[PDB]
Design a protein around this nucleic acid. Sequence first.
RNA 1: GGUCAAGAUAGUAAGGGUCCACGGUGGAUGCCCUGGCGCUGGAGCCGAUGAAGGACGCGAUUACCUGCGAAAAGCCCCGA
Length: 66
Amino acid sequence: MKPSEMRNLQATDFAKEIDARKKELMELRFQAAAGQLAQPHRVRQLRREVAQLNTVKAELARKGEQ
RNA sequence: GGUCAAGAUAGUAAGGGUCCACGGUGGAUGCCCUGGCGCUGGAGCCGAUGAAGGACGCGAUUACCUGCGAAAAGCCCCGA
């Protein structure tokens, strides 16, 4: 989610922890339009995760090279 | 009482007038402020690591605005 158990992983996993959510974030987005989205928040969350799932990855891009 | 004659005179308002009562219209007036004006002082550059100012977007529902910008009404960190 954010702690040292987020970065904890592989760069590729970051992607996996990305390209998988936006796979949920889709089926969700579909549901909505199809009517049944009972997890309005899920959306916002899943989303918020992807944010972190990059901000971090991005924090590395400078720590270990400057 | 009456009839006849001669006189005189009022009343009704279709509509109007003045005044009062009560209303409608309309926004003056008074009180108020979520908005302005001036002077004093403070502060005084921004931009190819891409401005100024904008287009299209982001929301469970979003047309206007606001904040942002696909990491999209927000993401990390430090403090409070």
